[PDB]
Amino acid sequence: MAALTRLSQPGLAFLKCAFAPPDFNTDPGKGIPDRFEGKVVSRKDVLNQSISFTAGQDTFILIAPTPGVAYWSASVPAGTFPTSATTFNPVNYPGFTSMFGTTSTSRSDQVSSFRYASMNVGIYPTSNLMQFAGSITVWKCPVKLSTVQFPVATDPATSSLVHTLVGLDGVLAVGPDNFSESFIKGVFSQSACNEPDFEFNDILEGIQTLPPANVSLGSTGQPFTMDSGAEATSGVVGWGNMDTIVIRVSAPEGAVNSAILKAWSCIEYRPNPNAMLYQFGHDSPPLDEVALQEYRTVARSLPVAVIAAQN
């Protein structure tokens, strides 16, 4: 029609990597069609994971704008939400270390900054009709990485300033805007840029946990903890401008809920001239007003999530 022909090629591809990634033989994605045309490296991260959910427990999954990490999860007692006693552990996309190194201070070695184009997730049940039970609930939270200021009685006395995840409290209640359906129907959902424009965010160095080491959960305001584990295997290298997708998979005692989890991330990175990665770079695509507008429209017109049978 005369709607998909006003789009530049990259603009069209942008809209695809953004809203419907499973539908393609190849990722159309090639960058963000905005004013920026500097050197970048487009990486389409995809995670494929056969997973089995713990019966008798509600498992929480967070699709956060943390480069290299597909998602963060933690399971709690049935019918409950994460508490101060809870800690989320990240599940990495393939090749985390080749992108961000093996020490908490080598995260900016290959790339210096980044910006997300898309961030999608899908859960495809693989249980038979005699074993599945439970539900899948999805809602989105405007989680941002801010900071907290507080005094410390050291000698001499000083004032601390550290990273804090703001709006994490949104994970402790299923908001009025949500998707909720039987486990067997699976689910597909996407996130979108939570800013009026696609600005670059810097790669963060040295973060392994939030609250960071030597800081009490209490002084940060966060409702629970984020722990990336061994610096040699994972870490938080940054926080993008996409809302976080929260998923609650609830399995009753005695149910066998198996599924395949998939996660997509179209990210545009600023490559370092010394990086081996650079030889794969190109210029970010030119501005495409139409695409930037359709993006916004489509984004707010789509439902929180849809059943798996339609992704």
């Binding site: 709607a3 006003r6 809209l15 809203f19 419907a20 539908d23 489509v298 017109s301 339609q310």
Partner: peptide
């Protein structure tokens, strides 16, 4: 229906109030 189709519809429905 497909997801790319659900989206291709929202694009042609809003680009219908544009011309």
């Amino acid at each position: 229906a497909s997801m790319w189709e659900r989206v291709k519809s929202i694009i042609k429905s809003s680009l219908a109030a544009a011309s």
